[PDB]
């Protein structure tokens with residue numbers, strides 16, 4: 650039993666809800682919140698911009714030190730950093746950005762990072778400003794992630810479409 654509330658169950662391990670991931674993280678304080686990161690951990694907009702703002706820029710400060718030490722992530726890769734006031738940990742996962750020409754096949758690799766954590770609160774990877782089809786992102790999620798994932802979908806209109814078209 651966990652503290653996530655109001656989710657629709659899609660599969661044995663994938664759950665979904667119309668919610669603002671920032672407000673959902675602040676309420677649940679999950680072990681792991683997933684950020685829709687880029688390789689530079691520059692959290693400017695989309696989910697990353699919103700998560701970073703909620704930490705009062707502490708996520709960005711931590712991230713800049715991480716990059717100065719380690720260099721950029723790979724597309725499809727991830728790193729674990731602090732969750733600050735939102736979660737115990739933040740798993741920064743880089744899905745391919747379609748508006749950058751990156752191979753959508755890397756989306757499966759990106760979701761594989763979720764399997765290193767038993768339970769996660771997460772957005773759909775590569776959705777929103779990363780330009781991929783959210784219906785496709787949900788399909789890859791369900792077909793790749795084996796651990797317990799609670800998906801927050803900000804757009805109520807998109808959420809209803811994701812539910813109604815789910816196979």
Ligand SMILES: N#Cc1c[nH]c2ncnc(Sc3c(F)cc(F)cc3F)c12
Nearest residue numbers: 669670695696699772773776777783803
């Ligand atoms: N900005 C911003 C946000 C603030 N809270 C959020 N909670 C969830 N998602 C997003 S952005 C987004 C989207 F619009 C569509 C999609 F398919 C995947 C996404 F990550 C935000």
